[PDB]
Amino acid sequence: DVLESQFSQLLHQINSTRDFESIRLAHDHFLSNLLAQSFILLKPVFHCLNEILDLCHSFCSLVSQNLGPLDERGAAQLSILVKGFSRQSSLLFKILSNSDLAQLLLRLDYNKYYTQ
Amino acid sequence: REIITLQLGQCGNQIGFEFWKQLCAEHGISPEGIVEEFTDRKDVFFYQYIPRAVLLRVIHSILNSPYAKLYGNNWASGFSQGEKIHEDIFDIIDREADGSDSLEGFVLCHSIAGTGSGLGSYLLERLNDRYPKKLVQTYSVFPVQPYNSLLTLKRLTQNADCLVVLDNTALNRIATDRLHIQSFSQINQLVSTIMSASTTTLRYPGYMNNDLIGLIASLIPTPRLHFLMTGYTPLTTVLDVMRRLLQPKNVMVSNHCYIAILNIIQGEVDPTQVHKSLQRIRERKLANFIPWGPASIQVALSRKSPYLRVSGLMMANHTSISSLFERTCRQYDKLRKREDNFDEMDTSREIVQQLIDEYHAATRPDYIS
Amino acid sequence: REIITLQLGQCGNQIGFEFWKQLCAEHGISPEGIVEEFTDRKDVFFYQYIPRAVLLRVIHSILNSPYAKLYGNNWASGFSQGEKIHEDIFDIIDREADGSDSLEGFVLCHSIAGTGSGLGSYLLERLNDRYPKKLVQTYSVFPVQPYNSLLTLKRLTQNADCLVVLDNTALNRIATDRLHIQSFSQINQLVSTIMSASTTTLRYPGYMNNDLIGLIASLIPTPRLHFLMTGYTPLTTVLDVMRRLLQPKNVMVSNHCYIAILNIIQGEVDPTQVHKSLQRIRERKLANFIPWGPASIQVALSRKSPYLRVSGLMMANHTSISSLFERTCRQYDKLRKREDNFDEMDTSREIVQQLIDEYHAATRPDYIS
Amino acid sequence: LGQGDFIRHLMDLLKPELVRPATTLYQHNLTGILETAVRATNAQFDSPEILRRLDVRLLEDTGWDVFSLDYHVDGPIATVFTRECMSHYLRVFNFLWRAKRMEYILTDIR
Ligand SMILES: Nc1nc2c(ncn2[C@@H]2O[C@H](COP(=O)(O)OP(=O)(O)O)[C@@H](O)[C@H]2O)c(=O)[nH]1
Ligand SMILES: Nc1nc2c(ncn2[C@@H]2O[C@H](COP(=O)(O)OP(=O)(O)O)[C@@H](O)[C@H]2O)c(=O)[nH]1
After folding, report:
1. Measuring from each residue's beta carbon to the nearest atom of ligand 1, which residues come in under 6 Å?
2. Which long-range contacts (CB under 8 A, 24 or more apart) does B172-180 make?
């Protein structure tokens, strides 16, 4: 809903203006929006969610690197991330509190983070 | 990743044949199993074309259809025969498995009412035995009749990693209201529209939802709560759709709150307003949710078949489905006082009661632990 | 916020049907309930367009009308039959309430003179049971008639949150003066104009009075004194309208003093001279006010419907309304000495005596305590 | 506040939020409610351009002391308002906000 929405405008600005000069600008603004909307340029959020990205690599590996219960220092490693993840979770929450309105609404549909 | 279908009993074989009818017509595939001249990724349900079906009197009716080129009553009576021809049918599944690139799941279409009830019970156990790595989704159908239904539950509660419910009594009520039928061949038509729309995002190439795991994994939070119910509005903005879905007059079911909601939009609606509808819908606080687990409402777009206007289908995991089970259990208890060991029914009686508690406990602020 | 209207008895249906005709023509709504091409906030009284009406022989003549696409005689007989269909009519209200975004109140149009009057008294009590936080305003209409009139008064004094009186004796005299009629369909023309004008500041939003409680919170000083009377200037400066409404030969009512006044000027008048006129009207002392607490006069402007000149509407709270109850009271006693317990009549006769006793004591310098 | 219909709904939605102290208040949350409020009232039928400038600002207690609308304006039209009309409207908007909550309190008591 940022791709299929920004794209649906880029294609509409094409079939409207018979001029070509608009296309070089409509397409250029389309591209800048993706870098701006998808938070790729916004450094703080992009340097916080990035920590969430590689975080799941560790957790998913932990469950796949065995088939028994988390006893051999897995639980000892398990409680490490939740102290950081849940910290990283609510850390992001203060960041969003222009464009985040479309995003934070979905995560907050049941007001769960409101209890965080 | 291909998914093969399995059809049992009268109901299963009748709707699955029609399920393909709607599916083959959705693509440009003539009844004689060939592409017509006249984008749509068809790898999941067709092999090169031939559908990956495994069917098990009525076959005569199907073999007499123009689609000839497209390929007891007690639970004990059904389960007994299935064990005898175990190796016979599992040859078909095996030869269809390795013939597939990477098998992913096992759709099952049957009615819990009679041979499909027991044979399906036999299959699900054996399917989990040989294959432990395969998802098992089932399109079970609800209505001595109660005894057959309770036995199937005992298997469906722990084997099938996913499930959908389709009750005829609620479906038949939709017939007299909006279709004025008073017929199986008519009430089945809605099922085909329900089934086909249930798997729209799999055949049309999209950003996400490219696998059965990509759909169900959002709904089922815990392997105990693996039941869904369906909703279908078109019988025109996105807000018009989402409102008409959540009305209790449209859903196919006969305190309580949702666990997760999925929305399937098969129209060409403008996708800029979709995030707006959720805003207004959330504010209206039209639907209640669990207070323990963070979840949301899922909405996904699609495209209608150009070879065939906006539709919409909704997938729901509502704790109100526990009410239906009670009726079966309530009736059985009446039968147990009305008339080689008769203990298998007793153990199932226990395990089905556990599921009723798990739903009831799920609506609490402290369901966990 | 929304306001659901109810129409009871022959009178409620007629004056409500004429209220909706006038309200549809005031807006851009075709008789087919479809918006014509041809600012006015219409979400309060119309649902996306569908009126939020609950109608309760006369229905057939409404259904044979061009507006079909827009949707005994005792008090005890009218009370019991409502008890036997208690669950029935509420399902219509329960779905309309929860289908509504945020309910605000319940407009009731009924005549207290007899199945409709009996049904009304029943419904007024149950709404207090179920919904405690919803206003109930009643556009009652005054005329074994003395019996039924006082019984419903027992409920209207402690159940209905507000009340606007409209007596036929004052309307009929107006029809035999400026109307010159010598019919029910004729006097209802005037009733429709007062009703349509009463909720004018709700449909055309302004800086103030954007909710039903905003109009009522100023007039009604205590929950007991919740009776109002009306005044129509026409049957031009703003100083003329005010001096043409305070006159007693324009009020729809057959010492004493005013408690609060509200003026609705619906014209295109100059809104800068409105504050001037209130500066002069005070000097001539055209109205006498309560001595205990402070009271004033209120003027509110609006805009007439362009799709259809200066008009006025005066809502006042005069203690002279106590006389109307006295007539019904005295008429009751004469029949009580002339002819399972007959104890409800005793309680109703007693409670209305306290209401009258409040009014006569509301005009004293020591109404406090 | 010349609209009245829109400010009514906007005072019903900010009630659960502003009762909390200002320390737990973050601007990113109130905007969502503001967008919904325009749709929930008659202000939706309006020029999209002027609706692009209407937002919220957080003055710098309680949530009923730091909330106020801004309606920032830049460009050629900014030569009529000149940063002083925007420093006067906010000086007015407080007096119209107080005299509006002191009324919806007194219609709640009633
Ligand atoms: N809704 C629906 N239900 C069906 C249809 N055909 C069969 N059924 C259900 O299947 C049950 C009977 O199955 P049955 O004929 O005994 O299966 P069999 O023993 O394998 O032949 C009934 O309870 C029906 O509700 C159909 O076309 N539509
Ligand atoms: N103001 C007004 N009152 C009416 C109208 N029609 C009937 N009424 C009143 O309704 C009363 C008759 O009630 P009726 O219709 O017999 O009650 P029902 O038979 O129980 O519906 C009379 O005393 C009238 O005063 C009308 O058009 N306007």
Report:
1. B 9-11, 14, 73, 111, 113-116, 141, 143, 168, 184, 187-188
2. B174/B235, B174/B252, B178/B235
